[PDB]
Structures are given as structure tokens and as C-alpha cells.
């Protein structure tokens, strides 16, 4: 269970952006600050930084 604390608004068309309060499915953690998250709503990819999310 990972919650997006701060909204992530990168400046690239690859990593997706999210808002605060949106849950994200962490795919790979305890490895690189940037993990690959997947949304269960639209069912798409979305790389989210680690300093913007935290286990709840």
C-alpha cells in the first residue's frame, strides 16, 4: 500500500504525474528512488518518485 504524499509533476512524456492522496501500485521498491507504479483505475503505467510517496 503506497500513498502519493506530494504531487509528482515531472517534465517528460514518459513518467506519469499524480496528485496528493492518489494511491499507486508500487512495482519495484527498496532499490532505486524512482519506482515503477501502475494505476488500477485506468490500468496504465506511471513511474513515481520515492520522495513523493510513502508506505501507509
Amino acid at each position: 500500500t503506497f500513498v502519493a504524499l506530494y504531487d509528482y509533476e515531472s517534465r517528460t512524456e514518459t513518467d506519469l504525474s499524480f496528485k496528493k492522496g492518489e494511491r499507486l501500485q508500487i512495482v519495484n521498491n527498496t532499490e532505486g528512488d524512482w519506482w515503477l507504479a501502475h494505476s488500477l483505475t485506468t490500468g496504465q503505467t506511471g513511474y513515481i518518485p520515492s520522495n513523493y510517496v510513502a508506505p501507509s
Binding site: 506530494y6 509533476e9 524512482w34 518518485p49 520522495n51 513523493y52
Partner: peptide, 9 residues
Amino acid sequence: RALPPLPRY
């Protein structure tokens, strides 16, 4: 890939 800058601070 530096981490994203913190919000206004």
C-alpha cells in the same frame, strides 16, 4: 535522475 524538487519551501 535527481529526485523531484520539494514543493515551495
